[PDB]
Structure formats: C-alpha cells, structure tokens
Amino acid sequence: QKSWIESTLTKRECVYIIPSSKDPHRCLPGCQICQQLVRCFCGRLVKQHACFTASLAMKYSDVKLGEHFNQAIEEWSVEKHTEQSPTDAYGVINFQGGSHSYRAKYVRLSYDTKPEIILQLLLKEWQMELPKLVISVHGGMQKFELHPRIKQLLGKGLIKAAVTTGAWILTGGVNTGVAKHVGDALKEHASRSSRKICTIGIAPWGVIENRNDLVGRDVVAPYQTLLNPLSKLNVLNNLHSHFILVDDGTVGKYGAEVRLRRELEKTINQQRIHARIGQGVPVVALIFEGGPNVILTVLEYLQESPPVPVVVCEGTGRAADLLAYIHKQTEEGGNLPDAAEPDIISTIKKTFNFGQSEAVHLFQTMMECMKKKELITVFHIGSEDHQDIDVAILTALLKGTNASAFDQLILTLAWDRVDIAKNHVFVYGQQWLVGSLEQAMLDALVMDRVSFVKLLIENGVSMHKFLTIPRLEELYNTKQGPTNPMLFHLIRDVKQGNLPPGYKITLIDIGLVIEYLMGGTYRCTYTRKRFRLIYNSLETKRFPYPLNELLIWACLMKRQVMARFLWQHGEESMAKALVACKIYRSMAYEAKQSDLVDDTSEELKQYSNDFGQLAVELLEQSFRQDETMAMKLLTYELKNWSNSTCLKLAVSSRLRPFVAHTCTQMLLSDMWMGRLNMRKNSWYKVILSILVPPAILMLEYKTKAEMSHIPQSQDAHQMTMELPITRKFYAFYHAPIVKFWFNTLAYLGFLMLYTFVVLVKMEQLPSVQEWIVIAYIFTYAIEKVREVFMSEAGKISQKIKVWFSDYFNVSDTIAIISFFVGFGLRFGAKWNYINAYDNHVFVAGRLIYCLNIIFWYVRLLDFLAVNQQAGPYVMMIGKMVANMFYIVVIMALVLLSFGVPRKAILYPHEEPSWSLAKDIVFHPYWMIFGEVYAYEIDVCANDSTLPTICGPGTWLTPFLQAVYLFVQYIIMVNLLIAFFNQVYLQVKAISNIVWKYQRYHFIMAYHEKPVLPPPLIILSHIVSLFCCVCKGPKLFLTEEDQKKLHDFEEQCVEMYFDEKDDKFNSGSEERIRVTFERVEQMSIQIKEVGDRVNYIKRSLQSLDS
Amino acid sequence: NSGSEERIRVTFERVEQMSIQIKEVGDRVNYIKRSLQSLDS
Amino acid sequence: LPITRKFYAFYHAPIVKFWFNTLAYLGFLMLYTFVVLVKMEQLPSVQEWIVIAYIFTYAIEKVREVFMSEAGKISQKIKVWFSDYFNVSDTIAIISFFVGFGLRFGAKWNYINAYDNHVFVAGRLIYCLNIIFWYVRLLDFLAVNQQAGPYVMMIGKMVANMFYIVVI
Amino acid sequence: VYLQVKAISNIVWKYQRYHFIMAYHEKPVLPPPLIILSHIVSLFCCVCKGPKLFLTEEDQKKLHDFEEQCVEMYFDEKDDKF
C-alpha cells in the first residue's frame, strides 16, 4: 500500500439512496426536482451519490420508486447502506495565509475505527509523543463572546498548563465552537515557535467547508478560510495541528465525531505516563459557555467511572455561567434552597430562552453536578480562586480522583510542575507514608527532576536512609531517563570484553571506571575489600556519605543540573568540585578518543570547567576570610576521596586557575621556606648558611605553631612534637629553598667547570675539572632514574610515560646519553700522540660536549624561572616560537626565491654539489641580520670582491636583492615585530599561569628531592637504597583542628552561595529586570483598581445626590 | 545620589515599597465596591 | 566496502588530489631548481624534460579549466580566469618558460664556450627568474593551513597599504 | 594595520577556500605530470559522446522541516534579545 493509514483506516460513503422529501414545490413531475434538490439522510443530495454503481442508479428519479409506501425509506442505515472503503483523503492542510503557512494534518477516517485502533495511529504515524495531560474542551458549539480579561487570562492557562505537560487538547477543530476561542489563545500567547501544544482537533466530515479539497491521498490541501457571512459550512480554526476528520458517510450534519472523542479520551486514560509511573495519563475537561447537550455531558463524567473531572469556568457565558452560578448556591449538593430553584430557573429561563416544562430535568441535571461538588472545579475567574486557571486544571486532577499524596506527587513529578507540589501536595497535615517519599526520590533521580529532589530533601528525605546498595544499582541501570552512552562504553572497556546481554551494572564496575577516570592511584570505596565483601554478601547496607555517591553518579550520567544541586549540598564542596571536574574532563578525553556515538566531548569540558570554577571561586572566598585556614583546606587528607587532597586533584584535572590562585601560591611559598622564615631572613643568609654551616644557627626559623597549615613529612612532624641544634641542621637542609640554592650552587659550579673543559684543551685522560662533571651527570642521571621509580604510581607504563612527558626529562636524557656518548668516544678512544684532534672519534665526542653544553645552559632557565618576573618570559620564548612558525616558513620561501636565482644567475657553470645547498640559503639568511654584502652586489662594478662572477645576467641580482630585503625587513621582519606586539599581552597573561602551575611541580619535587646536590646526592641514594634493602608531605591536624577546619569550609561555602545571590539580586541589569516585572504587575492593578474607583464616584454622588 | 547605578537602586527600592502599598490599597478598594453596591443595591 | 571502491574513494578525494599534486610540485621544484642551479647542456636533461612536461600538462590543465568554467560566454570565462591572481602569473610563468625553452632549445650552441649565445643565456635566465613564480605558488599550497594563509594574505594587504610610506 | 588585516585575511582566506576546495572536486585525480592521461581519457572519450546533494525523497522533507524550524527560532530569538 505504501500507506499504513489507508491500509488500516477506511472511509464511509452512502452506498444507497434514501430520498427524504416528496412534495413537488416546483415542476410536478418530481423526478426532475428530485435530481437537484431532494437530499438523503446521507446528508448529500441523491445525485451526489456518485458511488459508481449508484451513479447509474440515477435512473428516472433514483432507487426506490416514488410511491414505495411513501414513508418507507427515511432511515439510511449507516451499516449496509453505508459501506467502508480505503481512505481517499490523507494529507497535510496548508492553511494558505495567516502566519508563515502553519501546518496541520488529517486522514478522514470512519468512526468504525475501534478505540484502540484510533490510539495506535496518533503515536506512530504522526510521531506525536505521548502526552502527560489531556484538556478536551467540551463547551459551546455555537459561537459566543467573552470579556477582555477572561479572554487573555484563559489564554494564559491553556498555554501554561499544556506547554509544561504534553497536553493533547481535544477540540472540534471548526472555527465556531470552543475550538474557535482556544485557537485565538494559541496566537496571542504564541509560545516559542517549536513543537508547541499539539492540539488534536477532531473534526466531523459534516460542518466543514472545502471538503472536496480534503479528498487527496498525500495531498497538500491548498486550504483557505473564507469569512463569507453568507457561508454556512464551518471552516477549520486556524491554530490547530493534527486533525481527525471523522467520517460518518454524511455531510453538513453532526454525529459520529462525538463517538470518537470518548473513544480516544478513554484509551489515553489506559496508556501510562512513563515507564516509571504506573498510573495512566489523566484526562480533564474544560467548559467554555456550553449549551443544553453540554450540561448533559458535563454531568455524565461526574457520574461515570473513572471519575473524569471537569473545569467548568464561570465567566465564559450562557451554560457555564449557570453551572457555576449554582456552585455559589446548592451547598454540598442535596442541601437546596427551595426559594432559589424558582430564581435560578428564572436565570435558566432567560439564557437559553428555556421552557418550564423542561425546567425540572435540566435543573435536575444541575443537581447531580452539585452532588459531586468535589471534582467539579468551578473556577471563579473573577478572584484568585485556587490560582490562575493553569493551576486550577492541574489542581483539579490531584484533588478529586481519590488519590494518595504519593499518587498526586508521582503525577506532578511527570508533569514537572513543582509549584503544584509546593502548594497543593506539600501543604499541611497529610499522611506522607515514609516509604512513599523514598520511592518518589527514586523516580525524580532516575529522570532528572532536580526541583522535586530539592523539594523532597526540604520535606524529610535523609539520603543516608535512602541510598542503599540495590537502590543505587538501579540509578546507573536505568534507560528511564537522560542517559550517557559513555558509561556503557567505559564499563565494557575496563572489563576488557563485552557486556553480557542483560547486564545490570554492579557498583564494582563503577569503581573500575572512576579509578580509571580519576586515574593514578585513586582507589574508590567500591573496589575496596570492605565494600566488595558486604556487596557480594547482600545500617551497614547504607553509605556513610551519600551525596558523594550521587555526585559521581550525576557526573557519569551527564546530569549537570543534579550535580550542581548535589554538589552544593553535603560537605567537602571543594573536593567534590575538583573530582567532578576530573571525572568529566576524563570522560571528554574518552569521547574524543573513541567515536561510537555523537561527540559530547565539548559538552563535558564545559561541564568540568563549570565545576573547576566553583572551586576557584570558593578558594578566593576562603582566602578572603582567613588566609591561614584556607591553606589548610588545600592539604587536609580527605579520606572519602581516596586519601587525597583538594590540590592534588586540581593538578590531575590540570586546573590552572586554582594551582595558580593566590592561596595555592602563598602556601607553595610557605612550603618553599620550610622551617625557615624567609620573611625575617634574607636570601643572602641562605647561601651564606649553605657554605658556612654554622651560620645556620644564626637564622630566624618558624615555630611549629606557624607551620600548622604547611603539610609536613612523616618524620618532620615527629621532630617538632617530641629549638635544639640537631633540629636546626635538619630544618635547614630539608627546606626546599635550601635544596634549590644548594643545587644551583653545584650546578653553577658544574657549568663553570664543564665550560672550563669545553673551552680548555682536552688531554688523553679527563682532568680533575672533567671527572667532577661526569660525576654530576651520572649522579644526576640516577636522580632521574630514581625520580621514575618513585613517581607515585603502579604502572611502569604510566610512570615512564609521565617522565618523558616533561620537557627536560627528554632533554636531560638527550644530554645524559650524549654526554656518555661523548665520554664514550672521548675516553673510549685511541690517542694519536703526534697530534690530537686527528682521531675523529675523539673529536666527535669533544664536539658532543661543546654541543651538549647548550642543553645545560637552557637548564638555567628552569632555575631562572623560579623568579616571578623572569619565568613569565621564559614561557613566552616558547609560546611564540610555536605561534611564529608560519611567518618563518614564508621568510624561507622568500629566502629561496632569492637564493636560487642569485646562485643560478651568478654561478652558472655549477656541477652538482652540496655547496649548491648552502649557497642558496647562506647569504640570504645573513642578509636578514644587518648584512648586505655590498661589494658583492653588482659584481661587475669596480668596487667588487667578486670581479670574476661578472658575466651575462649578473645585473639582475641588485634588483632581486632589492626586492628580497624589502620583503624581508620592510614586510616580514615587521610582521614579526607586529606579531610579537599583539601576541605579547596574550602570552603574558598565560605564561604567568603556565609558570604558576609548573611551580607546583617544581616545589613539590623538592619536598621529595634529597638534601644533597647531584655530585654527592649519591650518598642520599646509597643511604636510601641499601637501607631500603633492610626493610608524602601530609597536613598533620590534631583532632580539634580538623573540626575547626571543617567549620571553616562550611562557613566559606555558605558565604559563597550567599554573595553570588547578592551580586545578582542587587546588581543593575537584574534590577532593571525586576523594575520591569514590577511595573508590569503594578500597572495591571493600577488601571484595574483605578477603573473601579471611577465606577464608585459616579455612583456615590448618585447614592446621595 | 544623582548618578545612574544609584538611581536604579532607588527606583528599585521605591517600586518595591510602592507595589506593597499598591496591591494592599488596591485590594481594599475592591472590598469597598463589592460592599458599596450592596449598601445601596 | 569493496576494494575497487577503496581506490576510487581515495584518489577522488580532494585532500588526496591536493597531497598528490603537492608531492609532484615539490618534486617539480626540486628538479627545476636542480636544473636552474646545475649547468645546462645543449639538450635538456632527464630532470629538465620532466619539468617542461609538468608545465605543459599544467598549462593544458588551465586551458581545460577555462573551457569547463561553468558558463556559456567565452568572453566571461576568459574574463573570470585571468581575474584570479595566479591564472595570470601562471600564464606569465608558462609563456616565459616556453620563451625560455624556446630560446634554450630553439638556439644554436657555441661549442667552444656556452653562455656566449645570448639567446641561450636569455632563456637560461628566464628560468632562473621564472622559478620565483613557482616558489610563490607554494603560498597557494601553504595557505591551506589556517595559521599560515592568514599571513600570506597579510603580505599583500600591507604591500598595498604601504605604497606611500615607501614613495616617501 | 595588523589587527585589521588579521581579521580580514582570515575572511579573505576562508573565502578563497571555497574556490580552492571546489576546484579539486572538479580537478582530475592525476597530478600535472601525468594528468594528461585524465585529459586524454576525458577528451577522446568526449568525442565519442557538478557535486550535488542526493537526498532521497523523505530527506528533502525532513530538511524542509528543519529550515522552517530554524527560521521560526530566528524570528523568535531576535524578538527576545530586544
């Protein structure tokens, strides 16, 4: 068929002919007039029954000869005299003209379609996602009129209480009924032009203009609404999406459409809201101005089961007025003022031009309405009764379908309307069965409903009680909500295989992810023997600190808005925002690496940097409250996050705005001093004390009450507890600043000797100055061997990979290898006694030194970068050398553009040679640097150093060179200058941060560097290794000092979440925003109130007169 | 006192304290007219 | 993906069409340069015929680039071809080269001493100067990069805007 | 004139890139020493006798639904930004 729509659905056509009129108004032989003016109970004319066999049944008059027991026919059975057929219509209405050619859809189906057959097209054919609500509108069919307030206010709600939910509004479609006014709201309050509220307007095939235009299989019906008042067929209202053109076989008349409307409104109450919720999608009913049949069908809902509620609004008009007028009377139904039933019937008499014989049962119909004054939510539009109508509808469903507060909560959890919950469920005395609240948290978590999580926490859900092992196993193992495909890709990687078919994730498998994401030696609670034993076993089946487990969940499941919510709660907020930043960042790098799904990788690096900026903005807030304790917050062992540190994490997330913040730069300096007080002391005295060891004793140290915030080593804290003299030499030599200035004076004694050897002639054997030099590099090599073996990891593959990843561990390896190549060729060589420097092996190693020397002078930029003025230029000399490579390629294209012609034009008798590789590159390079070779330009001139190069064509080179240098100096060299000017301020505000971040890795290499410099560091290796064959810097806080510190972090977080609140709520652009929103809501209650005053004074002067 | 950022500050604080005595006062008016039309009727 | 659709998929990729020219052109500039720099005999050498061959087939590739430049007006095709910086320079560089080969090959030979024939010399020196047109091509190829090209485009927008400082 | 010409030479470059890439979609396969074969084997074969987006039918439909969607947002976000 190529169309499932017409494969399943059918169409009704009057396949028989039933006249309904006999009397010849004109032209006594009725056969003539019966052709054109005698219609069937088919509605269509007897000749409009084409129906090819029935077209030949346009015989003399038609089927059933004139007499035929005259009153015989007059029935038109819709069963056999109206058969079915495959649908000839199905398309997309264009609505040509009125707003950007808004679309809608239809089929033209028969009402034969069983209720379940009608639901199983709306979802899968038209891709209408299942609703959370249904706002069938059962008011007046004939057009009616409203007041400017109620017109727009009810247009606020049908947009508000339906855009939030799914809200398949059920209308009549036509531009005359309630369908009329609802569409007018859809334009005035035009929502964000998107999939807005998809109104599913059931239309009859009866009162419909352009019915022929609808007859097209996959046809864009060029539809146009004529407002011709002479017209009688009702045009479809403009603002309606998908239509259901119910086909009864007839035209012009009502009927079948009402049958479908129950029969879809009853199966959508049989479909479930969501996999998590067990309820069915509820149904409401709204009444605008009603009518006689309306007052009947309003009631039957209040009677029939399930109790479909109703939202009959009072202000609209004729019927709805009185159905609400009686709500102001008839208290609890059965109680009935018998003196008012003549009065209200007198109001019924005047509105419907209504009869008194019929005044008992219509009045009676309003009684059982009033016997059910519990779910008939008579919205008093006038006042603030129950709220704006948006809330009234959603409030009508909860209060009235005999539903537990849980069952009320699970619905609002689906709608994602919290305001309903805070003010109609979390109101007052209410049963709140505690197990229920727990189960609701399980649902708000799996989806993403942060706002109900906050709500439930703020109404008694202690996560300690609600975070057991099997519950949290689900929270990873749910497709019932926003999911991250990485997590099921990470787990199958670490398991090194393929997940079995079902595979509910175990929390062990998560630990193997976070220990892989965070990395290094991070060891999570899940993998440890305690958890791994109580887990396989199954308040021990709870967790100690739950929001540390949910925060690693919302960050593996890419639920930021939860992570920001679960981060700000709990404790350790600065370690949670630097673990998160390391989880995401370590997820983002997996995304870029493996491409099995969409990228997602820049969505995370923005999520990480959002956590890696709350930490930094929380360090500042602490550093601005107590600079001392705020440096304890960076070094206290955490013990929930793998015996780690709020500053070793940032370094692992490579977060520079923290490691290069001013509190991680004081501490790094207070750690750089050591026990020394280099505030009271001076750098002269360090060097003076290193070479005069007794001068160590004339130094101003710090007390162990000043070194509180500094992390100290294992035995370092042992000393201070249990200043004596042996604790002066230990305190100095184990200071980083001393470890530094005790190397820099061996290294600057290395470079003064190796340089002395490089420069001075070199004999068969090394000299005293040269053995000390070999000795440094050897012991400096070992110091880098040992720097690998003790680089705080278990994976040799990862230690070696992080060692060579630092700029100098390579260069040192280049410089250490080369030197022993050098010593290899220098010492491991023969000796040509008659003349040294003939042995090209000796020479070779000789010249390894003279070039290896350059590696060691650039070391000094490691030592020289300790300064805060210098280092940020040493880091610039690299960030330009990179960013300038392409200006410099051009300058080498300009250099061969000149050198190849200059060398060809001048030296034309050149056999192939390697000097043709120098001479095309040599002079044009020195030209850039002040040289011009002036007596070589114009080689035929008298003043020539090259009077032999003169010959045919050599007059071209002054021109080539003129163009060359113009391009070099006046264009390309000033393109460098211009480059270095405009990349200076950038690279200067980066090379600082790159420097302040390499400072960590520099200082915290001296806290584990030995004491002794690398000529005689070997003793501190000897006396660390043979003693090792016989068998970090932590913050030691007593017990109360942990307590005072936690009280400080809590205090500083509280201010952070309180000052941001102030900087925004008490800014300017926000303050203009409120002043706008106030003066909005003022001016409404100005003109409204001020009107009423004038309606008083015009009366008050008439009351007295 | 006659700048801009300060003048937005006051205009905020005024429209705060206005709007309190708008809705409060404007309520009471409606509680009169619903009565006044019933005092005479 | 079948095998014949691997070779068709690669060789008909632009990135491949590029890096399959830039390694013929950088093999052109390594040879023409070799000929420019090295002495030049009565007849071209192996390194020099390949060079003539590139420019010829590179000329045709620019002939055909006109005839298939998506238009009907020859007056408009030719006008949009010469309107690009290099279609001129290439025409300067292709003409000049065959002027060069014209004078280099279409010339006599003073056996006692080359470089006396000022026609030979003349074309010899067309090459040594035509070479500059082909090194500036590399700024067409080198401008594919998003860091480099935006300097190659600066070296022109300054040479224009600086003419008057340079007259002074 | 560096910051000017740098915020222009990018745009001049990104615009010559079209005319560069979309010259290779119609450049032959073979480089210009032996592109002649792809001329030979385009011309004598021519004596014997562009890059388009091939969308099925539904993909035109999904694309038009996308353009309509993105225009609607454009005329709706400007409305909000002001």
Ligand SMILES: CCCCCCCC/C=C/CCCCCCCC(=O)O[C@@H](COC(=O)CCCCCCCCCCCCCCC)COP(=O)([O-])OCC[N+](C)(C)C
């Ligand atoms: C004395 C006579 C002989 C020597 C004189 C001649 C010496 C010649 C010159 C020498 C200059 C030496 C310094 C530069 C080399 C890299 C240093 C480094 O750590 O780079 C990186 C390690 O990046 C890695 O991926 C890990 C290891 C890379 C090793 C590459 C060696 C290249 C040099 C070849 C061997 C040359 C030895 C020649 C001798 C046989 C660090 O990062 P980055 O570099 O800042 O940025 C790159 C970023 N990246 C990490 C993502 C990649």
Ligand SMILES: CCCCCCCC/C=C/CCCCCCCC(=O)O[C@@H](COC(=O)CCCCCCCCCCCCCCC)COP(=O)([O-])OCC[N+](C)(C)C
């Ligand atoms: C943290 C990790 C990074 C650091 C790496 C550390 C490791 C360093 C890496 C080194 C790798 C480089 C190769 C080894 C060097 C020698 C190569 C060579 O050419 O030797 C020559 C000498 O060979 C001899 O045996 C005689 C001289 C003594 C050798 C001293 C060099 C080894 C010292 C290493 C101490 C390192 C331990 C350092 C402590 C850890 C052989 O050739 P020849 O004799 O010249 O040829 C004769 C020719 N003729 C007769 C014609 C003249």
Ligand SMILES: CCCCCCCC/C=C/CCCCCCCC(=O)O[C@@H](COC(=O)CCCCCCCCCCCCCCC)COP(=O)([O-])OCC[N+](C)(C)C
């Ligand atoms: C014909 C001549 C042509 C030119 C020849 C070559 C000369 C010119 C070149 C020279 C050096 C080339 C190799 C090293 C530099 C490359 C790396 C770099 O630039 O910076 C990078 C590393 O480096 C730094 O961040 C610090 C910079 C170190 C200073 C370099 C010493 C130069 C002095 C030598 C004096 C000796 C002179 C005497 C010698 C006899 C930083 O760059 P970035 O942008 O952050 O990139 C990302 C980095 N990341 C991945 C780590 C995050």
Ligand SMILES: CCCCCCCC/C=C/CCCCCCCC(=O)O[C@@H](COC(=O)CCCCCCCCCCCCCCC)COP(=O)([O-])OCC[N+](C)(C)C
């Ligand atoms: C398009 C953009 C604008 C360009 C601007 C203008 C471009 C330049 C225009 C220059 C004017 C023309 C100069 C040459 C004139 C003829 C020379 C001649 O006959 O003999 C000369 C030969 O030497 C040469 O021919 C060498 C070329 C001259 C130097 C080129 C200029 C470079 C510097 C300036 C560039 C910028 C200057 C700016 C201008 C103010 C000398 O006489 P001779 O005796 O034959 O030689 C000695 C031999 N003998 C010893 C055996 C006897």
Ligand SMILES: CCCCCCCC/C=C/CCCCCCCC(=O)O[C@@H](COC(=O)CCCCCCCCCCCCCCC)COP(=O)([O-])OCC[N+](C)(C)C
């Ligand atoms: C600008 C203000 C200054 C004045 C302007 C007025 C200009 C008046 C100029 C007139 C030029 C004609 C005079 C020379 C001819 C006579 C013979 C002669 O000397 O031949 C020389 C050829 O040298 C040349 O041909 C020189 C260059 C010619 C072009 C002149 C510059 C063009 C304008 C600028 C733009 C150009 C592009 C620049 C870049 C943009 C050879 O002589 P030689 O070198 O001594 O060699 C002798 C030895 N040998 C026999 C062994 C070989």
Ligand SMILES: CCCCCCCC/C=C/CCCCCCCC(=O)O[C@@H](COC(=O)CCCCCCCCCCCCCCC)COP(=O)([O-])OCC[N+](C)(C)C
């Ligand atoms: C090997 C030995 C001999 C050669 C070595 C000596 C060579 C000497 C130097 C040569 C420099 C050659 C390269 C630059 C030429 C222009 C390139 C181009 O396409 O420009 C433009 C084409 O603009 C047009 O209007 C269409 C054609 C203009 C032709 C101009 C030729 C000028 C050189 C005369 C012949 C010289 C040949 C001398 C030889 C007899 C493209 O635009 P644009 O330029 O980016 O900007 C201008 C914009 N415009 C289009 C609005 C105008």
Ligand SMILES: CCCCCCCC/C=C/CCCCCCCC(=O)O[C@@H](COC(=O)CCCCCCCCCCCCCCC)COP(=O)([O-])OCC[N+](C)(C)C
């Ligand atoms: C898209 C297109 C853009 C590019 C344009 C493409 C077209 C290229 C445009 C070219 C125009 C330039 C003029 C033609 C070149 C020769 C001029 C000359 O001086 O010739 C000389 C040689 O003449 C001979 O006939 C003998 C040598 C063979 C000639 C080969 C050159 C032509 C090849 C063209 C192949 C092009 C086809 C490429 C495919 C399209 C004549 O002078 P002479 O003999 O030295 O004089 C006597 C010397 N004596 C005194 C020492 C005895």
Ligand SMILES: CCCCCCCC/C=C/CCCCCCCC(=O)O[C@@H](COC(=O)CCCCCCCCCCCCCCC)COP(=O)([O-])OCC[N+](C)(C)C
């Ligand atoms: C005495 C000597 C005095 C000086 C002599 C002369 C030397 C100085 C000059 C030299 C070159 C002069 C001719 C070419 C450049 C002119 C055009 C230009 O500037 O840019 C224009 C085109 O070009 C570009 O947009 C790209 C620029 C390419 C770089 C030029 C090559 C330089 C290298 C050569 C190395 C060889 C060196 C060795 C040689 C032996 C763009 O300009 P624009 O502002 O956008 O204008 C509008 C453009 N529009 C109309 C297209 C929209």
Ligand SMILES: CCCCCCCC/C=C\CCCCCCCC(=O)O[C@@H](COC(=O)CCCCCCCCCCCCCCC)COP(=O)([O-])OCC[N+](C)(C)C
């Ligand atoms: C690895 C780390 C080691 C630590 C360093 C300490 C151990 C290294 C120390 C000493 C080792 C050498 C001892 C052997 C005897 C010396 C002989 C000698 O050369 O004498 C010369 C002086 O000395 C020198 O010229 C070289 C040694 C001193 C200067 C160079 C090293 C300075 C750095 C290290 C110290 C400062 C460090 C400060 C930096 C902050 C004098 O003799 P001459 O010049 O040949 O001429 C004599 C006259 N005659 C020829 C006419 C007869």
Ligand SMILES: CCCCCCCC/C=C\CCCCCCCC(=O)O[C@@H](COC(=O)CCCCCCCCCCCCCCC)COP(=O)([O-])OCC[N+](C)(C)C
């Ligand atoms: C148009 C596009 C073509 C595509 C390219 C492929 C075709 C071109 C390939 C080969 C063509 C030549 C074949 C003939 C035989 C060679 C003879 C010869 O010169 O031998 C020399 C080597 O060769 C050279 O020095 C010149 C050729 C190779 C280097 C220059 C081109 C490199 C680019 C192309 C390739 C890489 C491309 C890389 C680009 C990214 C050796 O001898 P000599 O130096 O004279 O000294 C001898 C000394 N003796 C007398 C003592 C013994």
Ligand SMILES: c1ccc2c(c1)CCC[C@H]2Nc1nc2ccccc2[nH]1
């Ligand atoms: C040349 C010079 C220094 C450097 C390099 C290259 C490569 C990266 C390592 C860096 N060294 C370094 N020493 C420091 C001391 C204090 C603070 C920051 C420091 N950074």
Ligand SMILES: c1ccc2c(c1)CCC[C@H]2Nc1nc2ccccc2[nH]1
């Ligand atoms: C010197 C250098 C390059 C150029 C000129 C002159 C003249 C204009 C054409 C330009 N070449 C070019 N190649 C490109 C490759 C990629 C993207 C953009 C590109 N622009």
Ligand SMILES: [Ca+2]
């Ligand atoms: Ca100078």
